[PDB]
Design an enzyme around this catalytic site. Sequence first.
Site, short mmCIF file in Angstrom:
data_model
loop_
_atom_site.label_atom_id
_atom_site.label_comp_id
_atom_site.label_asym_id
_atom_site.label_seq_id
_atom_site.Cartn_x
_atom_site.Cartn_y
_atom_site.Cartn_z
CE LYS A 1 20.57 34.78 45.19
NZ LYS A 1 19.61 35.86 44.81
CB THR B 1 34.37 43.89 49.17
OG1 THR B 1 34.56 44.20 47.78
CG2 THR B 1 35.70 43.33 49.68
CD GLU C 1 36.12 33.49 43.46
OE1 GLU C 1 35.35 33.55 42.43
OE2 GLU C 1 36.30 32.31 44.09
CB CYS D 1 35.80 41.85 40.68
SG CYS D 1 35.49 40.40 39.65
CD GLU E 1 34.72 46.83 42.83
OE1 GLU E 1 35.81 46.32 42.47
OE2 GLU E 1 33.71 46.14 43.09
#
Lengths: 494, 494, 494, 494
Positions: free
Chosen positions: D186, D241, D262, D296, D393
Amino acid sequence: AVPAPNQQPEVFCNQIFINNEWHDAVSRKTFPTVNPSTGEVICQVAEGDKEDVDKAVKAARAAFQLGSPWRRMDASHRGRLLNRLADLIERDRTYLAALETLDNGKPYVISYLVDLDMVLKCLRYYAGWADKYHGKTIPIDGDFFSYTRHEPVGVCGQIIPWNFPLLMQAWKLGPALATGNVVVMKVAEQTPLTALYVANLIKEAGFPPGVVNIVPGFGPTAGAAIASHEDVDKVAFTGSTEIGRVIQVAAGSSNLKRVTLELGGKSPNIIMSDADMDWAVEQAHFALFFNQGQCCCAGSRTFVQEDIYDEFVERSVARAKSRVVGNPFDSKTEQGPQVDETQFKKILGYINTGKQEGAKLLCGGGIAADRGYFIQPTVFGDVQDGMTIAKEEIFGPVMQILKFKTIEEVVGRANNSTYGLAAAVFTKDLDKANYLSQALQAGTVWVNCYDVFGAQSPFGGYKMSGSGQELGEYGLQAYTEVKTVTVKVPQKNS
Amino acid sequence: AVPAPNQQPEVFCNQIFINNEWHDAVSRKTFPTVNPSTGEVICQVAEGDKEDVDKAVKAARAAFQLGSPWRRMDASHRGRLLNRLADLIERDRTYLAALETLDNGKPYVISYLVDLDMVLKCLRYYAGWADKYHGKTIPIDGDFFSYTRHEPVGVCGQIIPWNFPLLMQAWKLGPALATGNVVVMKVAEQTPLTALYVANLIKEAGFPPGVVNIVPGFGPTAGAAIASHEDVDKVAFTGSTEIGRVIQVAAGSSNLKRVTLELGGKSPNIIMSDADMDWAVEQAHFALFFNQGQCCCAGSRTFVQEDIYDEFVERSVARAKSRVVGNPFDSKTEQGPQVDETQFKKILGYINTGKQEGAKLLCGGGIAADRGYFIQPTVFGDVQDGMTIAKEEIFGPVMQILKFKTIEEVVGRANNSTYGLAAAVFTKDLDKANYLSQALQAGTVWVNCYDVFGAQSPFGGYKMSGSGQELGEYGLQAYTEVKTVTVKVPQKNS
Amino acid sequence: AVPAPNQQPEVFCNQIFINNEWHDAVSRKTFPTVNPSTGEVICQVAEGDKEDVDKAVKAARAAFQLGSPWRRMDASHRGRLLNRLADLIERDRTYLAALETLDNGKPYVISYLVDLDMVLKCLRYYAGWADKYHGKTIPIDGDFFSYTRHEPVGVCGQIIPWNFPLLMQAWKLGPALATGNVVVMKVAEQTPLTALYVANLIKEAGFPPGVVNIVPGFGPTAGAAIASHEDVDKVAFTGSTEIGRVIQVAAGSSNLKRVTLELGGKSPNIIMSDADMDWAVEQAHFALFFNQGQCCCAGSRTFVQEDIYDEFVERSVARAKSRVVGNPFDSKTEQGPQVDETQFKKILGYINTGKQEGAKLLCGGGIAADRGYFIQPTVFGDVQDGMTIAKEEIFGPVMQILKFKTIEEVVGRANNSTYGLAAAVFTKDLDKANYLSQALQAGTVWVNCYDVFGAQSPFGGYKMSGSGQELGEYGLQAYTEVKTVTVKVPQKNS
Amino acid sequence: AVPAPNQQPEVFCNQIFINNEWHDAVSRKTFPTVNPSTGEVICQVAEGDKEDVDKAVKAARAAFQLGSPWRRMDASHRGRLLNRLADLIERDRTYLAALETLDNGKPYVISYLVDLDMVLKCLRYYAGWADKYHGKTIPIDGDFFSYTRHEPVGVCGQIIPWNFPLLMQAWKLGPALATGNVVVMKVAEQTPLTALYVANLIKEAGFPPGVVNIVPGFGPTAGAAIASHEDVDKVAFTGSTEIGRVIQVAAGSSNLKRVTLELGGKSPNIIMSDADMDWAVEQAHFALFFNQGQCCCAGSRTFVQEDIYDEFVERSVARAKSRVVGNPFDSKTEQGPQVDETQFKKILGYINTGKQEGAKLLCGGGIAADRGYFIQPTVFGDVQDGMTIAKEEIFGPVMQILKFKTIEEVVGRANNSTYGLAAAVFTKDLDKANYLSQALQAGTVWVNCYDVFGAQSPFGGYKMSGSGQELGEYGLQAYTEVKTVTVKVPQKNS
């Protein structure tokens, strides 16, 4: 040669072990553990919950803290400690062998000669891995020095089943402690006793407090609390595939902790026409009836080549009918009671299904004693793939024998399953052996044997038999975190 | 499907390769390389001497100097270079297949479809190893950081035989270059052409000068020079069981440089009664007749069970009697000539020995051509262990068939040898296969196959068949230096 | 906290160990082993010659017979036995600590807390490797199943030095017995006692007879016989840089047996200007003076940057001048006597040479006692590269301190040596530490420390410093045979 | 050397990739992909749903069927294809680099020299792994032959983010395809185009149909379908996340498939006073502003020692002020737009958030262009640990600079995070780097560098940065199934 057992060994530990201290449940609640042979209550045990888990998780984290005794200690010393624990358990071998038989019900001779042998070998094996699991130095591109650190994963939630109380404890403690992790272990309400005493030997070994915490209680509470705890880095669950879904669902919803599962199966034991009859008959019998049939990888699906089907069944029914059921402490006893009443009735309800489903009941099928949870060694003939007994894990003394003709047939029927924990092939043919061990979708394939586990040999499952492995070197992976360190250098050279 | 060959390939190289440049022999001396099919001179070749060797070592030594392009070169770029070399080699596959046949005499089909196929895979295989051979980080006692570096050994001398000119060049350069060493290669006087052209592609590939140096010439001088040079860090020689020691002593007297050897054999082929006759027959024929009998691991001792001897023998004679000998450039040609006259009369000499010794000649046994070094496919029957043809490696198309009854007997007779390079078993029985593969003292045991070499599959040998390994991950060991770095740290933690 | 020493320990073993049996030399000849503290003869020891080596090798070969107990032993059981040996050694730790001092001269405190400590851990380390050294399965091309066996190499000849009598024997036996080998060990004539007593423990531990055979005696007789034996598969020699060659030719000229060498060196210890004076000085002293300066990797070349040279030199002399020399059994004694008069006069002769060459004698330079083989802690300054004392390994309490200016310069000079055994760098700079750690041509580089060995850490040398490494997982390689087994399968799948 | 780009590259792929075929959505639905530099719609793309996913999964399963081309394929051949695929990608380097900037917004110069270089390096690295991931042979107790097989996990679902469209695809396909898995991928709704074009090359590369299937579309639809599919064996999700949690539970409730995660990070960049200011400042800028802040592992937390803080702040703010924002196709442009409007508003809200929190805005802080989603390089100073900008983040060009005093202090503050993906330390001192590289709780620590990624270097994370890693040999772990095969043998011997 098995030392005479104490049929009524006194229990010394029955509470919550934390920081090398024995504690009561915060709630002060306890649960009874029963002798599966008599149905009588052995003793009361602390009923741990969320608050007991937090206490245990608080103890572990602080023991896992940088600079802590456990974290700074030589990797070699961790193994010395593990060897010590091995030494002490061996010291208490006859006692533990009896307590395991007392709470679990497995015959003492097995508890002494198999279970406790396997526990000692596993802990001693992993002691040897303590300072031998290396990271790497990597020839990364550019003027850089790159290496990896295989650090402990951290605070590890560990939930184990009742079918092999002590050895499950060892299978978990081994790699986790050899790798520098700390543990909060959840033991099965049916068999929490031997693990509570080993925690004593963990204390006697020299292990710092907080490194191993055992919280006895019940699954949905203690077990769930661990699975949900926000300061737990990983949870290893062994038990019902049902709760497993619960664990994985809670785990993602808590902190995304690392999750490994080791669930059930419906292992095929495939006997090809060119197999050694006597040997395959006895290994097939062992394959299913071992540990009162309560084995993760019990050979609950016996496929036999049509040319030999009749003979095999004949000997298996003869073999099954001769199996001695009774007092686990009696040397003659081959099969003790089922772990508990629920399991007791569950297996009976399965047999009942097998009968109504049309499977040929050849022997056993009912209760083997008016006292305890005894069930007759049961053998069903002419079993079909669609039958409930041929699909669902019974975890009892119920043997399923299915008929097949060709090798292409048995592979697809064997592999036509949601499980994939184990499998076996009995045959003299090299090409048959290789064909099958490649084609069968199982984490473990035995050839001309069954239930052969080595401390060095990993044990992992396919499909809905979970992920990850146990024993061997692979075990150290799931208990280790990999850290890459890439340092700038003046100038790299080969 | 093989592209039509150039029966008259032109040779572009016949000089000494140093620093990516073509040099004349310091002596200005040359020698002729000759076609074994006709026995006429292919061309003149630079006859390297000690003086040329010293040039090569100096050129190599400098290319390996710390900070040099090659030494600063990225590990992954090293793989690209070998991969590029593979790509260049594929481009010239048809050209190289013709040249190898021209100088060596093996059929063009085998050169194209086999030999060069394995050259590409070996180079492509080791190209992937370049940046994947890790060092370790070690959980040592005390407050230290310990890791290892896998450094190149340095200047590596390599002496290769003539039976597989290009494949041997590849087996040696493969692990050498991927692991960052530099090379001074001495090729066979009988087959120097293909290696010289390959040095050229190395030039085009982009290898820095000095990284590969090739000095054509003869053993006692060039070969001796590499073996004696005091700045040679390693010497890899393959060939005669006799000369190998000369290396071990000549080097062991110089500067104690690293020496691994891969020498001759008398590999036993064991045909069990329950093996597939047709398969066993064609494999046994291949096992010994492959590459005109010029193989280190030739199944030079075919052990056949009594119960199947007669049929196996009959089948063997026809197969060999049908083996097509002639112009290697003939598509229908199965077997080319021996590499040179020295070999040709030598094998002729052995056939004679058997005849006198009482071995039953069943076919071949003489010269198959009045031109070239062609020998008839020969089969000796009723061979006994004590015969010379059963003890010394013949390296020719001479087949030895021995008869046995029990597996315990063949184990001992098969193992009763100064050699141990390879062995084979043909059987359908699982237990025999496992028993024999373990009991046999050989570096490689093939079961129901023969001459099955993997670039990823290691190639070693027992006893006087040589030390060290080739192919697989094990090959990189011999071309790597382990340096341990132990660092003091503030406070060690797991 | 060290237990009181027994300054006159009884001698219980002084003969030849074969098949767990004590034998006299065939000739019945014996030799005396001396106390270097008094020079007096301790006792008489059987003088093994070739004839006795024939005896032991024949016992070893039979111990390595296929189907033998040692061959059939569980790999895990080999590990149990090594653990048994260490246990018995631990029981006899004080005794062995005293006999090691009496025979060798090394301080009792060092023998107890260091020597036997490392001895115990080495044996316990390799006990854990026993069942963890795996072979590989290889995803080779074609329809084949390929795997490797890491078999034992076989009969291993082990010749060990006198500087670490017990640790050397443990250093060799550990990996060898862990990989399933059998051993014929030649012990130092200067130091045969403690190893012979261990021979008693080897027997007591449970090792099957003939698995370990120890033949004490002299090199040219005992030593050469092993090195030339035609039925010895591998010879491991540790010691003299001169004698090592005798091995390589003797074995290469005998049966092509596998040969490993461990020779001396002149390891450079580099102290940068930004290093910690206190630490660097104390380590620089330790590096050379440890074990009466009789260590292969002693830092006999002290490079000190110009800016700190004088202050360092000043401090080093003070340190050495203070070093306590005397009765090895005295807690305050820092440095005992040299191993023998041969070594004793040899090092005095070296001091003599260093004086004549113009090296600055700063302290010591003579005999430290009228009795025994004691030599004063000696320190030479302003040592130059061309001086003998900076090129040949003295193996004595003689310190060389050199001056240098640039980091580029010390690398060339440090690597400007025939040896490449060890090295060190002292600095607080990260780039300096990495820069040097890579560019130094030594098998072992210490950073801000010296002589830091972990049993888990390998020990090998570059150039003429010998081959292979000791300790670590690389230690199992030299005692392993790789057997490749490649089996044809019906149809290969990923 | 950068070739001038096609600023308006043509789109050749825009549909769903199944079995090497381009298909329309079952629904025939399409979605528009936007150019973040112009804000205009680039083109229409097939919008896959559950139905389109189910198709791909079945086609994947079909290619994974035992005996299929991809299953029978030699492991080494698997490597030829990945090497082929990279080759084809290199050929289309300039086109793919242009398309990536068009669709993603990152500067073409960076897309060309960084992303596509890294993509190539990843593929060619894993190509060489294909035949180098060996199983092991294990010295199990008893008369058994035990080995493990590393089979593929099966159908691997791969959901990738938008910040590195091509590199993320490679990081997933590389290890998956090298170990013989099949893929249903995807791609991000923001960046589906370059990934689609590669699918075309995968076909030209020669991968058997169904080995790789790419489904463009949206997360709530395609992604959820893949994560919940009952026939997908493992799901690897990379991205938000928050979403990471959804996958783990859907997988837990779907089929208990293998799930690697991840997620985001708040990686601390720790600058010690003795670091190289100039180096530290330019690296610190890069650490955060690389890829428009959309990494990231962005150094989103810059810790600077108080003694050098003022100057560092001074230097960093100017550096940013000089940072060029604009058309990514203009060579002088350092920073393109954010990927989209969602990301665009998100960063503005965060910048406002810090403004409100009392963080000192030192530069930027607003919109940088009227067209597209360009945002001013923004620098916050005197940031506190409790601030949201110091905890969450932002994934934008927003720099947070924190002040500290001691090394022990910054260690606790740095580790005090739900993230543990990366970390970095700048210092010239050996002990500080080593101390910090050990104490920092991060999957990856850089010393005196940042964002240094090597194909051979593993890439994982601690805490809530996810589980499992990318790159290296560790990257294969997640894509492998371990099968133990244990065979009864006549008699085991070493």
